[PDB]
Design a binder for this molecule. Structure first.
Ligand SMILES: [Zn+2]
Ligand SMILES: [Zn+2]
Lengths: 12, 74
């Protein structure tokens, strides 16, 4: 399904 | 399209919103409902747990909002 703001932000 | 009133019980408001999912910072996570031509809704307004939301985002399965999910599909 199409989504928005489901990407994990960097800082790991 | 982030600050729309996605459904009759929509809780997201540009004047009060704060992050809930681990993937949110300054904007609400959203998912597309495939009913008819389709429409965007806020994931939180659908009571979707984070893992369910992430799984939906990582696959090709279509999502149907709580308002249209029981409608006979085709
Ligand atoms: Zn909403
Ligand atoms: Zn819908």
């Amino acid at each position: 399904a199409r989504t928005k703001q489901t990407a994990r932000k960097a800082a790991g | 399209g982030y600050w729309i009133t996605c459904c009759p019980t929509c809780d997201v408001d540009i004047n009060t919103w704060v992050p809930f999912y681990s993937t949110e910072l300054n904007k609400p996570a959203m998912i597309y409902c495939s009913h008819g031509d389709g429409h965007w809704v806020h994931a939180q307004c659908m009571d979707l747990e984070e893992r369910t939301l992430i799984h939906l985002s990582e696959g090709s399965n279509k999502y149907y909002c709580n308002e249209h999910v029981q409608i006979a599909r085709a």
